[model samples]
Target: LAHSKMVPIPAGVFTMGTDDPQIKQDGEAPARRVTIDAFYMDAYEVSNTEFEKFVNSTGYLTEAEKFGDSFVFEGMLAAAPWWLPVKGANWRHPEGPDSTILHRPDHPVLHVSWNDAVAYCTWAGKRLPTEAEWEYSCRGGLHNRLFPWGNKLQPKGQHYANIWQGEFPVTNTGEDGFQGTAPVDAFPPNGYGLYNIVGNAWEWTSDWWTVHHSVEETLNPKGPPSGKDRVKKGGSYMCHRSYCYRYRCAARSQNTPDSSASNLGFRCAADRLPT
Candidate 1:
């Protein structure tokens, strides 16, 4: 009962990173063998309702709130949206000062920075998934597959994850029944019973950014000891096949520790023992 929402990912080894990366600069090549110990992962992305509880109890001020603003995707803005920095946009008011979390309490909390996520994790007695754990869990105990479910983006001409459809930056057909973020548990769960692991929102990992990985078999590796940006796993609603086709298990993106955006959010992970 202590961890009802956390799923135990069995200890195992699989190829980490990707050899067939869509973006060359992403440094997804040189897939290496990695063995991650058993760890429990949140079955769903952290929701606004969850974050609200932390704020209500701890009175912690997120960086986005203290900094006075965050990056808002143009498509999310009703007035004028093309990646504009809007004022007063924090976890509670994801889009901008005018927005509220009331309507989307069950949705993944957005505009959360890496620092904010760490705070939430610390308050919850949890930690973020290391890069190795993230990719291993994301694969769903399977080998190198483009997606958790399988190689096919849509197995039967059906959408499984929430992502941009049609033309990007202008039109989002909303073909997946969502224009922005779907409910935290919107789509089907992967083999490990994790929801929305790749799409809907880009979840933050607890690793510093580095294009290269150790070219040796290892047990539970992490990012650099320190770096300018932290690695963000999965992809978000803004991902498009035409532009950023990084909505796969092995894909990686990075951002500053204090930066926040509408499509960026995070879930928590924990060690199997007493965490």
Candidate 2:
């Protein structure tokens, strides 16, 4: 069942970026057409339960664990401290030594760095998606739509993704039934049957960071040879219209390879194995 969850994505072409002035960012411009080969991507983000198996099998120490700390949202912390960096805040203890995945085994694992994600993918015989593949798959065959589902963020006045519904870092309305990360499968799947492609946790992509995309290589384009930060796709539960409204398909962000945060996580992808 673990491997069966890998959904097959067909080889195809799709518009890969956005030019919508209101939603556009520096690296998300010049909306270009790109093509990708057939691939398989995990139907859901890697969950705490899934990650636990990897930990038990390999006994690997995550970067957060090695560093003995990780970043947590100020609102989630006591007194609402700003930019609070807490010790003992690795994946196992997401909010500090007190928190556990006991109740949220199905939620996307948090506080995972890009390097840790790569390690998990390596162990599972999978890999992180390239930024292009990530966008293409997130678009889920839709052309330049605002989101994986469509332009309507909350179509028919219904909340589709697990994003902040009220004033961020102040009062969470829990309008979407969650103020923090929801279960990896809590929301409806996109057109491709992939769950929560956006607005659960920011997924790490394999490509390195670049200010803008080059239109020259449209076929399976990997990013630059090297860079300071790797690319991350989708937004997280903390996204809100007033602030980090990056829950759109073409939206992206980046972080150093070793950075970890409560809102960050990743999914796995793989090239189609030979028949």
Candidate 3:
């Protein structure tokens, strides 16, 4: 009943966070070593068509649908208010009731909250990757590098990921060939064959939010025991170097488990089978 698009990530140890000055955040300090067991993760973000199957089987209503609104990027709205809550905005109608994912069957499903992602994971017999697992997989075997690809934003003058190019919130040049979310496989995969690990959309992880990491719990650490907000790894297409430059692999953010936004989405992961 599940579409098997999983990639096997062998067990390994690597530095989790960063000490880089250019793009470091509060929670991503004191770069520490972390280890995780072998696991299987989705090679691409969950697509609109994939989510549709889940909906069709369960007759589930997304949180945005129940709430009657979801947040959308400011630029998408005519007024451009950074982030505006729009009525009738859900995964089916990302921009609103007037908008649809008609031609974007392969695009990542947007307006999904952590709660919604959990529901999908439960149905699929998978679970969200822990914060450490997400970072380790996103690194794709690279250590302390700026991105999943490497240090260069545009390696050899080629766009590797979908991110804002022009002035953010006002204009996007689509220099990366995308003004909004791109196809799940829009870009080349990382060393581990995972696509769009750091860009395209902010992915939900299983960890709850915390301002700092504990050195004592490095082995498959799952984050704090509890918190109001859940951890979100990677950044969205709206990320620009000038502002919100969080598309880097080690970057992190959080949102309330129930909150839904147009730029937020998720992937699933499962434990490796016993040999």
State the TM-score for model 1.
0.95
The TM-score ranking, best first, is: 1, 3, 2
Q: How well is each residue in 1-275 modelled by candidate 2, as lDDT tens digits?
A: 34227888989988877666345554788678788999999989999988988899999899999999899887776223545778999898888888888998889999999999999987888889998888888988788788888898888888889888877778889989999899888888888878888998999999998876665548888889999999998899888889777898888888899999998999999996422
lDDT of the candidates, in the order given:
0.87, 0.85, 0.86
Instruction: Give the per-residue Cα lDDT of candidate 3 at 65.
Output: 95
Q: Model 3 Cα RMSD, Å?
A: 2.5
The residue pairs in collision within model 2 are none
Candidate 2: where are CA atoms >4 Å away?
1-4, 21-25, 78-81, 273-275
Pairs that collide, model 3: none
Candidate 1 per-residue C-alpha lDDT over 167-258 given as tens digits, one digit per residue, 9 for 90 to 100: 88999899889998998888888999998999999999999999977668998887789899999988998888898888899899899998
Residue pairs in clash, model 1: 74-81, 74-82
Q: Please give the lDDT score at residue 63 for candidate 3.
A: 93
TM-score of each: 0.95, 0.94, 0.95
Cα shift from native, residue 203, model 1 (Å) = 0.7
Cα error, candidate 2, residue 262 (Å) = 0.3
**By lDDT, who's the top model here?**
1
